[PDB]
Amino acid sequence: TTYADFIASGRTGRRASIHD
Amino acid sequence: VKEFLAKAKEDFLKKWETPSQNTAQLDQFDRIKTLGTGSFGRVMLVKHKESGNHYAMKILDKQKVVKLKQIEHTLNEKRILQAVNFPFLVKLEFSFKDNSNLYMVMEYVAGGEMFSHLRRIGRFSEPHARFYAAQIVLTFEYLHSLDLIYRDLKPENLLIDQQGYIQVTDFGFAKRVKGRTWTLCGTPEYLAPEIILSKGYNKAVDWWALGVLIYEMAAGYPPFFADQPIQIYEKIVSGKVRFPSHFSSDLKDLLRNLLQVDLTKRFGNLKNGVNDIKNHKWFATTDWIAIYQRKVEAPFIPKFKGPGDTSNFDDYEEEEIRVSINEKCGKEFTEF
Ligand SMILES: Nc1ncnc2c1ncn2[C@@H]1O[C@H](COP(=O)(O)OP(=O)(O)O)[C@@H](O)[C@H]1O
Ligand SMILES: [Sr+2]
């Protein structure tokens, strides 16, 4: 399921900002 | 209303023109614990000796800010935060600096990040997500009327207070601009495609960000996700999005209008402005004046065990504030 794929992804925790 | 912002914009302009400086000093507070850590510093729960009040102190290492070339962005953050005043924006209480760091003392929002509750519960129901979305809608209308673009909406930057209402924090990328800007900044999952494509952009990116937020709250996962940001970027510019089967048709229609790659068709950026959003069907039951006055009963109230309670925040590795005997980058942060 989409949820399954999300929970298995490496971006489920706090997301950091980008500066570039 | 249309004239509430009148008065509002007047108070902002005075504080924007002539900003407050050095309104406290480090020895007035007792540092207690870390609430959230970041790129150039952290946020700690502190306690004001003279009054006994708890606050949230953001500490920025000057040397680190300069290294990552965030001087202008940092000055922006403080200059704007000290000038704004809205029921759903975190209140900046004090600000000052020393040889090594920059400090911003704000009100302490004890409920924790919306992020933490969102991940724990899984997802919020539509009326619950609508409650929170309504608040952002009014805040962005307030912010845009002052020529400010937020640029960093995400559950991690939204705190729930004792009433269950939200307070927007972190103005790291907030900027006052009439026209368009070009900085690639924000958080991957929430970046509008025109930011990625480097076309130059305006306030429309915030409304895009709102579509992503509402989607995440209701689905429990962002519309565009992957393991690596570049992969995420690829997805965003395609605009191809799928909706959970449980999303109401009214919600799907609002999101198709917010998550629109063509600014010419993006809600919030049309002749009717914010009203295209406020008058949408999904918001029909929402009484905007009741939200603003905070009289609506919040659907979720975080558990509170007295002030100075940090139960709603995960734990972090503690560090000791380091203050050099030599002034660091004094000229760069003269206006702070
Ligand atoms: N006024 C506040 N009250 C309570 N917690 C806060 C407050 N401000 C920030 N925090 C916590 O600290 C974290 C980082 O604050 P933030 O301003 O976003 O720092 P950064 O710019 O390093 O990302 C937030 O996600 C939140 O958990
Ligand atoms: Sr942040």
Ligand SMILES: [Sr+2]
């Ligand atoms: Sr920031």
